[PDB]
Design a protein around this ligand. Structure first.
Ligand SMILES: *[C@@H]1O[C@H](CO)[C@@H](O[C@@H]2O[C@H](CO)[C@@H](O)[C@H](O)[C@H]2NC(C)=O)[C@H](O)[C@H]1NC(C)=O
Ligand SMILES: *[C@@H]1O[C@H](CO)[C@@H](O[C@@H]2O[C@H](CO)[C@@H](O)[C@H](O)[C@H]2NC(C)=O)[C@H](O)[C@H]1NC(C)=O
Ligand SMILES: *[C@@H]1O[C@H](CO)[C@@H](O[C@@H]2O[C@H](CO)[C@@H](O)[C@H](O)[C@H]2NC(C)=O)[C@H](O)[C@H]1NC(C)=O
Ligand SMILES: *[C@@H]1O[C@H](CO)[C@@H](O[C@@H]2O[C@H](CO)[C@@H](O)[C@H](O)[C@H]2NC(C)=O)[C@H](O)[C@H]1NC(C)=O
Lengths: 116, 148, 55, 49, 116, 49, 116
């Protein structure tokens, strides 16, 4: 089976920073597209950042210049560096593999709450 | 790449229009399978789970043993509407880059497709990689594309 | 005021891009029809005016 | 039967072309629909015309 | 060359029984469809029964419950068991290989005559 | 000539597609009809347009 | 590179004869179509004779019964035998390989001038 185990979330003040990590197993990491998703309470899922197999990256507009996605293939890890956090960033964040067809999978999530 | 855009304009030309409640064929056990049914984060359904177009089933080889190239296979698509009604059948094919193709389908060469109904024939050859930018879609990045 | 004349709509089966040649002919049938009906209606008015003036 | 008759049992492909009108067909191997409108004698094969 | 040699026909009373056999050679029997045909005098050929390569069988309506076709691949033999014979069954009976295209072939026939 | 020019002498296949209109062609190897309506110079090959 | 070196031209009286030769190198001669062309002064190029890979030949009408093309594959040579020459045959003559697509090539030419 595929396993995706996120951690690194926490409660932090606005303007602060966090680093999320995602431990992957049970599939061929280096040939997968990798995603960060988030779910703000009251809302559905939205994509935040993705990285393809050559290290090229894409971001949602609202996180540009704030969040950075990266991958460490040798250690089967996905990272999300989150700088200059906003209250509106409060959400559960999920790592994901191959979220577009056929067999998308999501991890268990790590909560990030930004509050003064 | 197809005539697909005119579909809703064709439909509106009829007085009565409905989507069948039955599946015209069984996807899982279709020729060249068995297949598992692909779903996507681009198409969130009502409870926000990964879904896909109700008109189609994304056929992905279930078993590595049968995950290989295939010669063209033929299925008959029956008429399941009630006498007097026209049936409009929606179908297509998914494609991707070379490496994703190998991983998904066990084959990374171009694939070929034909349809035939009432003497009208159409032919398509797929494209591997080098796709145009995403447009009119779910706004989520994908390496692959479908033709419908 | 009570002359009954049928109206003109699109072909239901003919699709844009696919059937441009048919659509050109459709436009042609409409154009000639409008002209014919106009002439037909014009004569009706001329005949009415004839009958009114003679009365 | 294909192997025995033609020395090949993969699907076969065909095209016609006349006055700018082109048509394309790919054959079917086995799994044919029931016989209809025919000579009433059982056959394993079918033709397309 | 292909050879098909039928025997077992005879003169029999109505209600009686016969067993036809067909000895085949010169081709690959186990991959052939096999047929029994008959020709009543004054008429053309009509099919009576056929057997495919997995032993599945088909019969003309008028012989159903009366005639049974079977094959013995190991001995290159086709059989037709004919029970509850009728006068109308009087005909020359022929075994045949691959009667539908391309190279159909017929045996020499064996006469069955049913009379009181 | 095919082998020398292109490194392949089997028939080649082509498709076009624009505004929902699709066409399909399979090429011919050798045995071509006589030259007509052309530059009047002998050629072993032919084009389809 | 391909090289085509023609010789054998000259000044000759009408009714006379010449033999042109063409030395070829740098390509596979025996699989090439071979051509003779000529350019009369004031005019463009016109084809005179061609020979295919099985030795079959074609000629322009005006040289029929007068000019003969031949090939010697073993010695990479093309010949043009020119009998019963006419003043109108005055031109520079060129040997050519595969003059129709993709990579046509012409030699350097040899002048033939026919005059009384
Ligand atoms: C939306 O998608 C989700 C996930 O694919 C569906 O939830 C699954 O529904 C199937 C029934 O088809 C069950 O077998 C699974 O156990 C469900 N899994 C989860 C995680 O919920 C959901 O039914 C879909 N809804 C619609 C309307 O299509
Ligand atoms: C598809 O989108 C990409 C970017 O998402 C476009 O690539 C950019 O094009 C602009 C020109 O307007 C350049 O200034 C950027 O440097 C390009 N970026 C990259 C990463 O290539 C691309 O042009 C779009 N496709 C088309 C056909 O316009
Ligand atoms: C084609 O014909 C066969 C029989 O010749 C049909 O198969 C039978 O279908 C009936 C249903 O009406 C069943 O009761 C029988 O058990 C079936 N027999 C066999 C041997 O399968 C078949 O349904 C026909 N095809 C179609 C599309 O109706
Ligand atoms: C194509 O042209 C060739 C000659 O250039 C034709 O072949 C000749 O046909 C005539 C009949 O009118 C014969 O008398 C000659 O012997 C043929 N010559 C050769 C070399 O074959 C040929 O018939 C033409 N093609 C067609 C379809 O007419």
């Amino acid at each position: 089976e595929v396993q995706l185990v996120e951690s690194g979330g926490g409660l932090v003040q606005p303007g602060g920073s966090l680093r999320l990590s995602c431990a992957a197993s049970g599939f061929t990491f280096s040939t997968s597209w990798m995603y960060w998703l988030r779910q703000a309470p009251g809302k559905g899922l939205e994509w935040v950042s993705v990285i393809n197999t050559d290290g090229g990256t894409y971001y949602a507009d609202s996180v540009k210049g704030r969040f950075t996605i990266s991958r460490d293939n040798s250690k089967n890890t996905l990272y999300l560096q989150m700088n200059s956090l906003r209250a509106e960033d409060t959400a559960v964040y999920y790592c994901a593999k191959d979220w577009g067809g056929p067999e998308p999978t999501r991890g268990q999530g790590t909560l990030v709450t930004v509050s003064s | 790449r197809t005539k697909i855009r005119q579909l809703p304009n064709l439909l509106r030309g009829y007085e009565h229009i409905r989507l069948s409640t039955h599946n015209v064929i069984n996807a899982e056990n279709a020729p060249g399978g068995p297949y598992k049914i692909g779903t996507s984060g681009s198409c969130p359904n009502i409870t926000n789970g990964n879904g896909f177009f109700a008109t189609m089933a994304w056929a992905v080889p279930k078993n590595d043993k049968n995950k290989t190239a295939t010669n063209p296979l033929t299925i008959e698509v029956p008429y399941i509407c009630t006498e007097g009604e026209d049936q409009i059948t929606v179908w297509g094919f998914h494609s991707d880059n070379e490496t994703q193709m190998a991983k998904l389908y066990g084959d990374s060469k171009p694939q070929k497709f034909t349809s035939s109904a009432n003497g009208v024939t159409t032919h398509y050859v797929s494209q591997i990689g080098g796709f145009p930018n995403q447009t009119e879609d779910g706004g989520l990045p994908q390496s692959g594309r479908i033709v419908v | 005021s009570e002359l009954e004349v049928k109206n003109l709509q699109r072909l239901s089966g003919a699709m844009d891009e696919l059937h441009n040649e048919i659509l050109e002919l459709d436009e042609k049938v409409d154009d000639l029809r409008a002209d014919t009906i106009s002439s037909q209606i014009e004569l009706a008015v001329l005949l009415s005016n004839e009958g009114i003036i003679n009365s």
